[PDB]
Amino acid sequence: SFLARQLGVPQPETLRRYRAGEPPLTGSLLIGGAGRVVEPLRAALEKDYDLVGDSFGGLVFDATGITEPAGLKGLHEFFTPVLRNLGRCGRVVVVGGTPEAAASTNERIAQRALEGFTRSLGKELRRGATTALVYLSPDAKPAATGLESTMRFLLSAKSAYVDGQVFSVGADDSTPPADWEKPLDGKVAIVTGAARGIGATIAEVFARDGAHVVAIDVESAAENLAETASKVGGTALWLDVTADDAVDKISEHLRDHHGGKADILVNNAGITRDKLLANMDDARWDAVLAVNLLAPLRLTEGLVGNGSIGEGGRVIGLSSIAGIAGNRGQTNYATTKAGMIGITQALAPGLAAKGITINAVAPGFIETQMTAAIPLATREVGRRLNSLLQGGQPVDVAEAIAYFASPASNAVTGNVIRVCGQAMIGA
Amino acid sequence: SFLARQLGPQPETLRRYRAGEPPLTGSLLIGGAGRVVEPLRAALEKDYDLVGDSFGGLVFDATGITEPAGLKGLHEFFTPVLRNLGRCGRVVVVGGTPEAAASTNERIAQRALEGFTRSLGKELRRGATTALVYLSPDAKPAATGLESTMRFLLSAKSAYVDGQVFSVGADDSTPPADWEKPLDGKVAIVTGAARGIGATIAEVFARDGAHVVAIDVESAAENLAETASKVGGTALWLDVTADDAVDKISEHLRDHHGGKADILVNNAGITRDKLLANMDDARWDAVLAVNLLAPLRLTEGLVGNGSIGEGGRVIGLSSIAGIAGNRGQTNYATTKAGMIGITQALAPGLAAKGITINAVAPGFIETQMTAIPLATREVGRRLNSLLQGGQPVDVAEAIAYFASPASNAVTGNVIRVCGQAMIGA
Numbered sequence: 077s078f079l080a081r082q083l084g085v086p087q088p089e090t091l092r093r094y095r096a097g098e099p100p101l102t103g104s105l106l107i108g109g110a111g112r113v114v115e116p117l118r119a120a121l122e123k124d125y126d127l128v129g130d131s132f133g134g135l136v137f138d139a140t141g142i143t144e145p146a147g148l149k150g151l152h153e154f155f156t157p158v159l160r161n162l163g164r165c166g167r168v169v170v171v172g173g174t175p176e177a178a179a180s181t182n183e184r185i186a187q188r189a190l191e192g193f194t195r196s197l198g199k200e201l202r203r204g205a206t207t208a209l210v211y212l213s214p215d216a217k218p219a220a221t222g223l224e225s226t227m228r229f230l231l232s233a234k235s236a237y238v239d240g241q242v243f244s245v246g247a248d249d250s251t252p253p254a255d256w257e258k259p260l261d262g263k264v265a266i267v268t269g270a271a272r273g274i275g276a277t278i279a280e281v282f283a284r285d286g287a288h289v290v291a292i293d294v295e296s297a298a299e300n301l302a303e304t305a306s307k308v309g310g311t312a313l314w315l316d317v318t319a320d321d322a323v324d325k326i327s328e329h330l331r332d333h334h335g336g337k338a339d340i341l342v343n344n345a346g347i348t349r350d351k352l353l354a355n356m357d358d359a360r361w362d363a364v365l366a367v368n369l370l371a372p373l374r375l376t377e378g379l380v381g382n383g384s385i386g387e388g389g390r391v392i393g394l395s396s397i398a399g400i401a402g403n404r405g406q407t408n409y410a411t412t413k414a415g416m417i418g419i420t421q422a423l424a425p426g427l428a429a430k431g432i433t434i435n436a437v438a439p440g441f442i443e444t445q446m447t448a449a450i451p452l453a454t455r456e457v458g459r460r461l462n463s464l465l466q467g468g469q470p471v472d473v474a475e476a477i478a479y480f481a482s483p484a485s486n487a488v489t490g491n492v493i494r495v496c497g498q499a500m501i502g503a
Numbered sequence: 504s505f506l507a508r509q510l511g512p513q514p515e516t517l518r519r520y521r522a523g524e525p526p527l528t529g530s531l532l533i534g535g536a537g538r539v540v541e542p543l544r545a546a547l548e549k550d551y552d553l554v555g556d557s558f559g560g561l562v563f564d565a566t567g568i569t570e571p572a573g574l575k576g577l578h579e580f581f582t583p584v585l586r587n588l589g590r591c592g593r594v595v596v597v598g599g600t601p602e603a604a605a606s607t608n609e610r611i612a613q614r615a616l617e618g619f620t621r622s623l624g625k626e627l628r629r630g631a632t633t634a635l636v637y638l639s640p641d642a643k644p645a646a647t648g649l650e651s652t653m654r655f656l657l658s659a660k661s662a663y664v665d666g667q668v669f670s671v672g673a674d675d676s677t678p679p680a681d682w683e684k685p686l687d688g689k690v691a692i693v694t695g696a697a698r699g700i701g702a703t704i705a706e707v708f709a710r711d712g713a714h715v716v717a718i719d720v721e722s723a724a725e726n727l728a729e730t731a732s733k734v735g736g737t738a739l740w741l742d743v744t745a746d747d748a749v750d751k752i753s754e755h756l757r758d759h760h761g762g763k764a765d766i767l768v769n770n771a772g773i774t775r776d777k778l779l780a781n782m783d784d785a786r787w788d789a790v791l792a793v794n795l796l797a798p799l800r801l802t803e804g805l806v807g808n809g810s811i812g813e814g815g816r817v818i819g820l821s822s823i824a825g826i827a828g829n830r831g832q833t834n835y836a837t838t839k840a841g842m843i844g845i846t847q848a849l850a851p852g853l854a855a856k857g858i859t860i861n862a863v864a865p866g867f868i869e870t871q872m873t874a875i876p877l878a879t880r881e882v883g884r885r886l887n888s889l890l891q892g893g894q895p896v897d898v899a900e901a902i903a904y905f906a907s908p909a910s911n912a913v914t915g916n917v918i919r920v921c922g923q924a925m926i927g928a
């Protein structure tokens with residue numbers, strides 16, 4: 077951070093990321109509050125975590141108890157004595173009940189207001205710690221097994237660059253993978269744009285988690301794509317995702333390798349043809365739409381519709397901060413990454429009726445060749461303009477993706493998560 | 504100094520409202536295809552120069568786009584005409600409510616428009632702004648419920664609202680007698696009105712016809728009177744957090760306005776900033792009671808006893824902090840998020856009653872609170888598409904829009920007044 081003096085800004089924390097074997101948090105886990113979530117959670121987490129009743133690894137506050145605004149007082153009461161003591165890369169997570177689904181307008185106003193609290197707290201925490209807010213459906217059984225994959229993601233190192241965000245967990249029950257640390261056992265994952273960078277790193281994480289990977293990219297990038305299929309011990313496939321036959325070409329490679337079925341499609345492939353709209357041509361527009369919006373929509377509709385992905389399936393789409401906030405010279409790109417959010421939202425119910433979830437991740441600043449292509453100052457500032465005071469890592473994106481792919485993340489659909497370090501930019 | 508030079512700024516002097524001035528600086532071009540282009544042309548022919556110099560406004564009807572492949576319309580309409588848009592120009596994309604589209608394809612496409620409008624907002628020059636308005640696919644072709652929004656957007660009043668998203672329902676609208684005197688013969692309770700913003704809301708309201716009831720605490724008795732006199736409404740000393748609060752206003756509505764008011768503005772607000780690990784009960788509880796508990800207690804009270812009824816208008820003051828959060832403000836942002844909470848939550852109940860409740864989240868506004876160090880002041884000021892802080896009028900203008908009698912199909916809305924501030928969620 078070579079402009080720490082120029083911007084009045086702290087040296088970054090080295091963010092603890094996932095390592096197999098290591099405990100998930102670096103301290104004890106406090107689970108406070110009141111409502112329908114504290115008891116069952118204390119219960120589901122007994123074994124794998126380190127429950128009170130030194131340094132706090134995690135702090136979970138149960139807000140579902142809070143039925144009027146006068147009760148918000150709780151957040152204060154619970155958090156004020158314990159922040160003094162949160163560890164390196166701590167994890168604060170507040171849990172509430174889906175505000176639209178509340179039993180009174182009064183309840184709704186308090187549960188809604190939670191985000192103000194969490195997004196603000198995210199701005200006060202030190203040494204790499206983060207905040208998250210999760211809403212659970214008031215029609216979830218009290219065991220609340222549907223909430224588990226999410227708590228486990230946040231209450232760990234994998235969520236290392238996921239800060240200040242809001243999770244939205246449905247009503248369905250969930251079933252834990254035999255092994256949480258190999259959650260993707262014998263799953264077939266399709267990952268587009270997997271030659272290098274974020275796509276490639278998705279494949280890795282997927283493989284690490286148990287999946288067999290179909291690495292898709294174009295002929296231009298074989299060698300780099302070969303090196304990837306190899307490393308995850310999966311299978312390469314040369315394909316332009318915008319071409320008539322693409323759906324046919326994936327289905328068949330599946331038929332020849334995986335019994336014609338898949339569990340996970342990751343729409344990662346993408347291009348950028350930046351230019352101001354006053355200077356934008358038809359070609360710089362169209363190309364970006366084809367790859368970035370038209371294709372992922374086609375592959376989802378294609379592969380679900382032809383039965384390649386069925387029950388228990390998972391689609392994760394690659395969005396962007398640009399699609400939420402906008403960006404100079406990216407009206408194409410940001411239409412497409414906003415459309416991606418639209419695919420996620422538009423298809424969630426339909427796919428829900430088919431036992432399939434669909435979610436998007438919207439990366440912020442990630443070290444890739446592409447951030448590396450930006451004038452160093454503009455680049456250095458961008459990298460540093462977040463609560464976590466640093467650029468994100470391609471692993472951090474893939475993690476959030478892998479959390480969506482989880483067989484126990486079945487109750488989580490239509491969600492949009494930024495992997496952004498709590499970047500300041502937003503809508 | 505060096506960083507500033509490195510990065511590359513020319514804030515335009517923003518045109519504001521002036522009685523008499525035309526509402527644009529140039530002619531209005533209405534393009535695109537769909538159920539909005541023909542009616543909008545016809546509604547606006549009188550007061551605007553439609554295309555048979557440079558463009559004062561551009562409006563692209565996007566309701567016509569039903570699949571992603573047709574997004575290309577945006578590019579075909581805007582690219583050619585962009586280079587010709589004037590100082591403080593205006594760009595507005597009208598679309599179909601995504602959640603209510605007739606296919607998932609449409610939904611994808613109409614949802615996609617926000618990425619476009621927010622980015623375009625970031626490329627416009629010379630103080631010009633972009634806006635996205637979605638209209639219920641259930642509105643009648645006449646589209647009468649849309650006008651108030653279009654007329655506010657396509658005017659100088661909306662000078663500091665940039666890059667936003669407006670949500671118009673199905674209901675029909677009757678226009679006021681005088682578009683320049685919209686609030687004529689309306690009674691408006693404006694809390695926190697002694698100084699700054701609240702005091703300016705009261706002005707803009709007078710300008711617009713309203714009989715204002717300027718409200719405040721006793722300690723600010725002096726400044727209230729000045730305000731009350733300036734606008735030609737009457738004053739009321741009361742602390743909004745008093746258990747008698749509702750009853751006192753109600754009493755006053757009898758004494759003066761037939762036990763009746765049409766608009767409520769929950770402007771009164773306070774701060775008490777503290778890192779949460781130093782937060783004491785006073786600082787938590789004070790703000791909470793003033794910023795969240797109070798506003799609700801007034802709204803629910805004044806609709807409950809019938810003081811505000813059919814045709815009513817509650818407008819609450821959120822904040823950027825409530826959307827994006829902010830260091831030292833867990834208490835404060837909890838409240839302003841709760842204000843959105845009040846707005847989203849009370850909207851269907853009030854809809855059924857003939858009342859619209861909406862919210863406004865100011866960005867950075869030149870005021871007496873903003874007492875902030877020149878290091879933080881200079882950055883929050885300039886970190887938005889428009890390269891400056893906003894004037895209080897900019898905020899009150901937006902409130903005045905909601906408050907229109909013609910804004911009956913506008914409810915549940917949270918509109919930031921931030922000249923597209925960079926910070927958000």
Ligand SMILES: NC(=O)C1=CN([C@@H]2O[C@H](COP(=O)(O)OP(=O)(O)OC[C@H]3O[C@@H](n4cnc5c(N)ncnc54)[C@H](O)[C@@H]3O)[C@@H](O)[C@H]2O)C=CC1
Nearest residue numbers: 269271273274293316317344345346347394396439442444
């Ligand atoms: N910092 C970043 O790099 C960020 C990236 N984005 C998005 O994340 C995703 C991955 O990021 P990057 O690694 O930078 O993506 P990228 O632009 O480097 O491309 C990903 C891969 O897609 C492949 N590709 C392009 N067109 C294809 C096609 N028609 N068929 C098959 N493959 C094709 C390319 O060969 C490339 O290897 C992209 O959607 C990108 O837009 C999102 C946020 C930030």
Ligand SMILES: NC(=O)C1=CN([C@@H]2O[C@H](COP(=O)(O)OP(=O)(O)OC[C@H]3O[C@@H](n4cnc5c(N)ncnc54)[C@H](O)[C@@H]3O)[C@@H](O)[C@H]2O)C=CC1
Nearest residue numbers: 695696697699700719720742743770771772822865868870
């Ligand atoms: N940049 C800005 O100015 C921003 C302002 N805010 C909001 O705008 C609103 C007012 O704006 P400002 O003029 O900057 O604040 P302010 O503090 O200058 O407004 C003062 C008014 O609040 C009144 N007040 C405080 N407690 C009261 C009570 N209990 N009962 C009756 N009146 C009471 C004071 O008497 C005074 O009339 C506040 O709600 C604030 O949260 C929103 C975004 C940022």
